[PDB]
């Protein structure tokens, strides 16, 4: 495993939460940057990251160093089978029917919020929504969602390591009978979709489906909670006028969501192992070289995004950011995350006329380590009707 | 505002700086264009990149507040919109005619030095040939009277030959004595045009303008600083390579004397370290693969780009038969290309031919330590002495 912390070498939690100064330095002085201590190549330009992520002919996901069942360590010469099987659960049809179910879960969370005093938007919406939503789309029976939610909070929400292997044991032992039941009772959920999915005649087995669900929870529960929490932090400490714009016209939420993914999702970075000699990045890369594509950095590249260090929900090409990746490994749950963010934002802005930060908030005292870097543990705010 | 290049390299021994082959490898492979935060400089190591920086005057200027060194008279800090006048005036002294007439005069000086070397006994080719030859040669082409060359040689040894505090006052006294001595000579030569560099600088005219007596003396001081020490360095490194690199090279040169030009050109590619010139960015561009803004300083490492496998096949090995050895960038590129390049090539060839023609073989000395015989210089580290045994 690659210790990415040595490449950045931050000396504070708040800097890692929004590494805007490091992004500037690396975009300006080290577009392609070899790090001697980790033996890794680091790319920050939009064109460079797009090459690394998309061009599978030269950059492989299968590699010793990392930062039909596991489609994240496989390349297109075999990736299509696992990709197509998993894509059958995320068709435009399923996404269309998930809007009222996700919208309904968000109503309970927003209707529960009353002002009176300061609220914690992380515990009240940012953290519970992805967990409650993914339990719904999995088809977990309603009477077990509490226990399911508890496992997900231990696994993917920030001795601790022994508590996690007991959660993994309980998860696999509980969900395997569920997958067996659903094969004889096809409902309208993801597990039922993974069962009947067929590619090249092959299908998933019961044991393979349980692993796949564990891959989806790890891929779109914490990252979605992070994006929702950062969206509210930006609505509080970045552009003050943005909230009033969203409430004047609710139709601007999709643009606001897409701009939060470009500007306020840190940090985004995936590795690729070089499979063929080339100088496609401006340096001579040999086979076996590890290249880290920094996407949260390339979303600030002025060669692609005009005025990149400012928030602008009217920038016409905000959707071409690389927070969801590029190429064959493009995020399969990207439309779901976009729907979750829009619904959580729409339902919130429709209720409250204005929001205001809290007096004594210190960013450094409310951050914890996470997969992307640093995540808000809580986010106090005052809300008004 | 001079740039301390030592912080970019940050060597931990003199021997590494004398032949930084491992550092070149890392930078060619991992940092082709390398921004250094402590000096705020861009560093280029690729052959194609260095050729852009050195040659493309439209974007890279020699006139710049920051320089890596320390009108019509100093043509090295000026750009083509004005560089042409000083260049042409100085070029009138280095025509193909003068170079042809300098061969017998340089050949005679090398004979004086080689017959003096004497047969058996270990010799120091730095004291015996590498150091004295460029000083004696440049005095001849300057037209310095024969009875005054001894004092002239001493001034050059203090100013441009490496070796507590007395040095800085000893050097400013040498420059003072130099300018006071040479000004009457230039006045005399205006009425006695001979066949030397000072006579050519007198009769030189560009755009109708000419040099004045005070301006010509400045120019001669620029030539001594530009082609006396660097040439001594190249000759000394050639003999070090003949001793510790390719053992078979000396016997090959003696079988066929016509290979000396190839040997000379390969020593300039392989064993001249370190070469580096600065350029200040005059226009926003991405011609090197990075976003360069106006006012940025770019250092073109030429001794490094001579090891670029994209241009020279098998670049880390000595090969005097490589067909493109002459495309190295040790003499620069573009409008500021070294004006004394044919002279330096002639001096190296003549010093090498005259030596191998006399001695059948050379052998290094038992207890030579490279680290104990190096001193600081303009290019990095220079040999103070180099013992060798000569035979036949
Ligand atoms: C803010 C939310 C999200 C972000 C930033 C995000 C980010 C990413 C990125 C960058 C990739 C590509 C990795 C690479 O190219 O190597 C990816 C892949 C993937 N994502 Fe997401 N994701 C999010 C939400 C979700 C959700 C809600 C799901 C729901 C299932 C999901 C499931 C997946 C899967 C299965 C893959 C692997 C697809 C493949 O490798 O072919 N993600 N994600
Ligand atoms: C091994 C021998 C030599 C080497 C490596 C060498 C190297 C160089 C280089 C690289 C430049 C260009 C620097 C730039 O682009 O800014 C230069 C310029 C110059 N050199 Fe040499 N040189 C050598 C010998 C000589 C000799 C023997 C003379 C005799 C007068 C000489 C006189 C000059 C002059 C006048 C310039 C100015 C050219 C201009 O600015 O247009 N050099 N030298």
Residue numbers in the entry:
A (entry chain B): 5 to 71, 86 to 176, 184 to 410
B (entry chain A): 4 to 73, 85 to 177, 182 to 410
From the paper:
Cytochrome P450 (CYP) is a heme-containing enzyme that catalyzes hydroxylation reactions with various substrate molecules. Steroid hydroxylases are particularly useful for effectively introducing hydroxyl groups into a wide range of steroids in the pharmaceutical industry. This study reports a newly identified CYP steroid hydroxylase (BaCYP106A6) from the bacterium Bacillus sp. and characterizes it using an in vitro enzyme assay and structural investigation.
The crystal structure of BaCYP106A6 was determined at a 2.8-Å resolution using X-ray crystallography. The final model of BaCYP106A6 contained two monomers in the asymmetric unit, with the heme cofactor located at the center of each monomer. The two monomers form 2-fold rotational symmetry with a small interface area, which seems too small to form a realistic dimeric interface, indicating that BaCYP106A6 exists as a monomer. The monomeric structure of BaCYP106A6 consists of 17 α-helices and eight β strands and exhibits a typical fold seen in CYP monooxygenases with a centered heme cofactor molecule. The heme molecule is tightly bound to the central region of the BaCYP106A6 structure and is surrounded by α5, α12, α14, and α16 helices. The putative substrate-binding pocket is located directly above the heme molecule and consists of Ile72, His80, Asn88, Thr90, Leu240, Ala244, Thr248, Arg295, Ala396, and Thr397. In the case of Arg295, its side chain protrudes inside the binding pocket and occupies a large volume of the substrate-binding pocket in a substrate-free structure. Multiple sequence alignment indicated that the Arg295 residue is unique to the BaCYP106A6 sequence, and other CYP106 and CYP109 homologs do not have this positively charged residue at the corresponding position.
